Amino acid sequence: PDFMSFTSHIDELYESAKKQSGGKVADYIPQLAKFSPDLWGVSVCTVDGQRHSTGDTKVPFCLQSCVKPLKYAIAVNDLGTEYVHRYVGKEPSGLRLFLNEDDKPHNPMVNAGAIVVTSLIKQGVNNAEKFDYVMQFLNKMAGNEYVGFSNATFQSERESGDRNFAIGYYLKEKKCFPEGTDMVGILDFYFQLCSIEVTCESASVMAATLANGGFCPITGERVLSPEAVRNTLSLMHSCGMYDFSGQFAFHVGLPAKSGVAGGILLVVPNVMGMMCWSPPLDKMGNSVKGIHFCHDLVSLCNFHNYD
Amino acid sequence: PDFMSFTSHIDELYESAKKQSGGKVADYIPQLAKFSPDLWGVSVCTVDGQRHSTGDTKVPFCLQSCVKPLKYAIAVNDLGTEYVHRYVGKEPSGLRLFLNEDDKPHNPMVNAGAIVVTSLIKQGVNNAEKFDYVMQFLNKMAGNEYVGFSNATFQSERESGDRNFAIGYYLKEKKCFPEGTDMVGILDFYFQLCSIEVTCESASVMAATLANGGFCPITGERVLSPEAVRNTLSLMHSCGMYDFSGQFAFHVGLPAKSGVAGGILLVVPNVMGMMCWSPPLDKMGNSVKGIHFCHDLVSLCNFHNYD
Numbered sequence: 001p002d003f004m005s006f007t008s009h010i011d012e013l014y015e016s017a018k019k020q021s022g023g024k025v026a027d028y029i030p031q032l033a034k035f036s037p038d039l040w041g042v043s044v045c046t047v048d049g050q051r052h053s054t055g056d057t058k059v060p061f062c063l064q065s066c067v068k069p070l071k072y073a074i075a076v077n078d079l080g081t082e083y084v085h086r087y088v089g090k091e092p093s094g095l096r097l098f099l100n101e102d103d104k105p106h107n108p109m110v111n112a113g114a115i116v117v118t119s120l121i122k123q124g125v126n127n128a129e130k131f132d133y134v135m136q137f138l139n140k141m142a143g144n145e146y147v148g149f150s151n152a153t154f155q156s157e158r159e160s161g162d163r164n165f166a167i168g169y170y171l172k173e174k175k176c177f178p179e180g181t182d183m184v185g186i187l188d189f190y191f192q193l194c195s196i197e198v199t200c201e202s203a204s205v206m207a208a209t210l211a212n213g214g215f216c217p218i219t220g221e222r223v224l225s226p227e228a229v230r231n232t233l234s235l236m237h238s239c240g241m242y243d244f245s246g247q248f249a250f251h252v253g254l255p256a257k258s259g260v261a262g263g264i265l266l267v268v269p270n271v272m273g274m275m276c277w278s279p280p281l282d283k284m285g286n287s288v289k290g291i292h293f294c295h296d297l298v299s300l301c302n303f304h305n306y307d
Numbered sequence: 308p309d310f311m312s313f314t315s316h317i318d319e320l321y322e323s324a325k326k327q328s329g330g331k332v333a334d335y336i337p338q339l340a341k342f343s344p345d346l347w348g349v350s351v352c353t354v355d356g357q358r359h360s361t362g363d364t365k366v367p368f369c370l371q372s373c374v375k376p377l378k379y380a381i382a383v384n385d386l387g388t389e390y391v392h393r394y395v396g397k398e399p400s401g402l403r404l405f406l407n408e409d410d411k412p413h414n415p416m417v418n419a420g421a422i423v424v425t426s427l428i429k430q431g432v433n434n435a436e437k438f439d440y441v442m443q444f445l446n447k448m449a450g451n452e453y454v455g456f457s458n459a460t461f462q463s464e465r466e467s468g469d470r471n472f473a474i475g476y477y478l479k480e481k482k483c484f485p486e487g488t489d490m491v492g493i494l495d496f497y498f499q500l501c502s503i504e505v506t507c508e509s510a511s512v513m514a515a516t517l518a519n520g521g522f523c524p525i526t527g528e529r530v531l532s533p534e535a536v537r538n539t540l541s542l543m544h545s546c547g548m549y550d551f552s553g554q555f556a557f558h559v560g561l562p563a564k565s566g567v568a569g570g571i572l573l574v575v576p577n578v579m580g581m582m583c584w585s586p587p588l589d590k591m592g593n594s595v596k597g598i599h600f601c602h603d604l605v606s607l608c609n610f611h612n613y614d
């Protein structure tokens with residue numbers, strides 16, 4: 001209704017979350033540990049293309065696990081729900097290395113499922129063409145705003161990702177991949193996808209595309225099928241916030257996805273997309289200021305699923 | 308928009324689910340095993356008070372686990388979210404006897420959590436007054452339509468409920484109950500609540516009250532607080548369908564609760580309530596015809612959360 005007055009409220013919510021200085025910046029690679037704890041930005045993009053930013057909204061950071069819903073959406077878009085879910089389940093595990101009763105990863109939002117989803121995208125071409133394909137897809141989702149790549153993050157991520165290699169070999173042993181998959185090459189592609197860089201501004205438009213039925217709000221183009229969008233939102237609602245996913249569903253009731261860079265990709269269906277970013281993470285791996293901001297936003301604006 | 312034409316579609320969906328003859332009638336007590344497999348009814352009550360029934364909609368059956376959301380709602384209504392959730396968690400387990408990391412039952416929809424919720428209601432009075440209190444509450448939810456009691460079910464349920472006694476003593480040992488709780492008397496009250504009888508017709512109005520923000524649509528009275536209703540819908544969405552809850556959330560995306568009598572209490576927020584009932588259950592414990600009907604209903608009418 002009144003965007004300028006909604007904007008004032010976002011700025012007050014921003015300002016209250018800012019005083020919240022707890023948490024620890026991820027440090028398992030130097031490219032994460034570098035980041036200032038005081039960095040804090042929130043960008044909004046409505047379903048009608050209205051924009052508002054406050055704080056550090058033009059500083060690039062890596063999507064990390066925030067890319068998981070986006071590549072899941074790409075796979076469902078290209079391949080359909082049924083094909084994708086031959087390989088990956090549709091529900092939460094407890095707690096956030098094992099497979100479900102059908103020897104599938106529990107869902108696309110845990111590393112095992114994201115690694116499997118990565119193996120399904122653009123099969124038969126080399127990694128450079130797979131990567132370019134996804135990069136172009138994210139450009140459409142972002143209405144051609146900032147989408148980059150951190151080579152330093154990619155190289156450290158691959159050198160230090162012992163757990164992800166253990167998962168890969170485990171998935172190989174349980175036959176979780178499509179026929180003819182080079183698992184080690186899939187891990188590389190996965191590491192690369194984690195290392196894609198956005199700003200709060202550009203990521204908010206990606207979230208707005210999900211909020212707007214798969215149409216990008218600042219270009220008007222259909223980027224994702226209705227089915228892709230719907231599946232992605234369902235899984236972001238139940239599985240997007242690591243071991244906090246249940247509590248977030250209860251108290252906030254919006255589809256969101258967090259990552260270790262401190263991003264929270266938030267969708268308010270039929271209203272807007274947002275990206276909140278602040279490096280310091282709580283014990284569950286979620287941005288301290290962004291979790292605070294999300295609780296406040298739903299209280300103020302009555303955006304809960306079952307409001 | 309056009310109720311009479313919506314009604315025709317419900318009848319076609321009813322008719323298609325009817326041909327679905329799989330499943331097994333529960334038989335762990337004779338009061339369940341008695342029931343014909345061919346019994347099948349669907350009742351709708353809209354948020355504006357419009358009614359439609361098809362099939363066996365006036366044959367009483369026991370709420371069984373369908374009562375779980377209703378007593379959880381009563382407790383939050385009387386005591387608030389914060390008090391109730393000192394005792395019970397807010398999220399799914401995997402798979403559907405243990406407690407969460409805080410030694411609480413995972414949520415109100417598993418037996419352990421429902422037993423704890425039962426211990427919180429109307430504390431300090433005797434069981435007859437507790438029971439009368441809840442019966443009167445269900446009368447308000449149902450707009451004074453059919454609410455009864457099966458004494459035969461209550462007596463068999465208590466004689467044969469070895470698992471529930473094991474849970475009770477386990478909860479007693481982990482200190483899960485409020486101070487001064489008679490655990491064995493709480494189990495009785497729990498058995499009694501399972502044995503409350505409704506028809507599809509009367510249960511649909513209970514569901515419509517949840518669909519309508521806690522106001523009963525055929526009387527207009529406020530029965531439940533906004534908070535009670537919202538909490539209940541969140542937990543029905545994630546935890547209401549036993550081990551099928553994840554898949555139901557994905558494919559159907561509505562708050563529902565199933566029970567072993569073959570009932571499915573379904574809420575379509577801001578639109579309507581329904582009760583589907585058919586005794587024969589699938590391997591997960593859900594009504595075969597009602598699961599089929601629910602999938603079909605969401606396909607036809609676009610009622611999914613993230614449609």
Ligand SMILES: N[C@@H](CCC(=O)O)C(=O)O
Pocket residue numbers: 063064065066111157164194258259260261285
């Ligand atoms: N690259 C990290 C992603 C961590 C995250 O964003 O949670 C991993 O694969 O473990």
Ligand SMILES: N[C@@H](CCC(=O)O)C(=O)O
Pocket residue numbers: 370371372373418464471501565566567568592
């Ligand atoms: N009285 C049954 C309820 C079963 C159900 O409806 O799932 C029990 O407590 O196990």
